[PDB]
Structure formats: C-alpha cells, structure tokens
C-alpha cells in the first residue's frame with residue numbers, strides 16, 4: 148500500500164549520509180516510507196542550535212488497530228551501511244508539543260539487511276510517557292531533548308548484526324502509545340556509536 152497526499156514541499160533529499168547531521172540543509176537521504184501514516188513535509192529546522200530534520204504530527208483520537216498505521220515512519224533508503232565496532236545506534240530526538248498529557252510515544256528502530264530477509268528490528272523499543280514531560284527541563288529554544296540509544300546486540304527473532312552485515316536501509320518509527328500528542332518532532336545526529 149501507499150499513503151498519499153498532494154505534493155508536499157520537503158527539504159531537498161540530499162544524499163544518504165551517516166552521521167546524519169542535516170548541516171547541508173538537505174534530508175541527507177531520509178524520507179517517509181511509502182507506508183508511513185505521516186506524509187507531511189519533512190523540513191530542516193533549527194533544534195537546540197543545530198539543523199535537524201523535522202515534521203508535524205497530531206495522532207488521531209480514534210486509534211488504528213495496527214500500532215504503526217498512524218506513525219511517522221522515516222527511512223534512510225539504500226545507505227548500505229554497517230555497524231562496524233559500534234555497540235549502539237543513537238540520535239537526538241526532540242519534541243515541541245502543542246498537546247501532550249497522556250499515553251506515550253514508543254520509538255522503534257529497524258534495518259533492512261539483504262542477508263536477513265530485509266528486516267531486523269532492535270528489541271529495545273523506547274517509551275516516552277507524556278505525563279513525564281511537563282517536569283522535564285526544556286532546551287533554551289523550548290524543546291524536550293532526548294538522546295535515544297539502541298543496543299545493536301539486542302535484535303528480534305534471533306537475528307544477529309555482525310560488524311560487516313550490510314544494512315541497506317535504516318527505519319525509525321515513532322508510534323502512538325494511546326497518546327494525545329500533537330506538535331513538532333525533530334531528529335539530529337543519527338549515528339552509530
């Protein structure tokens with residue numbers, strides 16, 4: 148299936164780049180998956196004094212049964228990277244809610260390794276409770292700043308990512324955990340470490 152809307156003015160696609168810093172004002176190869184429930188503009192905005200890729204999302208009040216149907220699902224296609232000696236994939240994730248009071252966001256990471264049936268999913272989903280936020284100190288520019296880590300030795304289905312396993316694509320999903328989130332999200336500094 149494909150989720151479609153009228154043409155939207157994304158920032159320039161650029162070229163797949165890791166670490167993804169967005170400093171060249173392009174998306175450095177990141178784009179919505181064709182199945183992403185969110186297909187609105189991906190742009191390059193300042194977040195916490197750095198350029199970051201960004202979108203808006205307000206999850207529906209009536210929640211789909213499939214837990215990713217409404218989710219931003221952003222992908223770095225055909226990067227063809229490997230983890231090397233790195234234990235983690237990590238990135239900066241920022242929120243600027245207009246509404247956030249209940250439920251959670253559940254952030255997943257996946258890869259498409261051609262040797263592993265084009266899917267390998269990190270086991271360590273990260274949940275951000277929205278009631279936790281009001282008590283969190285914001286950045287100077289009014290954001291909630293998370294640095295999210297995924298231990299690449301914890302992968303579902305017994306699949307193993309070795310130092311040399313080709314990762315064709317990287318996917319990040321920000322799923323709705325029965326939440327009332329509305330507002331802006333941002334990614335920066337997407338990298339292995």
Ligand SMILES: OC[C@H]1O[C@@H](O[C@H]2[C@H](O)[C@@H](O)[C@H](O[C@H]3[C@H](O)[C@@H](O)[C@H](O[C@H]4[C@H](O)[C@@H](O)[C@H](O)O[C@@H]4CO)O[C@@H]3CO)O[C@@H]2CO)[C@H](O)[C@@H](O)[C@@H]1O
Nearest residue numbers: 180182213214215216255257259263264265266267268303
């Ligand atoms: O639905 C929510 C549920 O999702 C689970 O993850 C699903 C994904 O939602 C789904 O998009 C993903 O589909 C993959 C599939 O696994 C790959 O095998 C397939 O690979 C393609 C490849 O991309 C092509 O280039 C190649 O030519 O063909 C191969 C084989 O078809 O690509 C599709 C699309 O990326 O499958 C996931 C695992 O089932 C989550 O695991 C779960 O947590 C969520 O709740």
Ligand SMILES: [Ca+2]
Nearest residue numbers: 168197198335
């Ligand atoms: Ca940046």
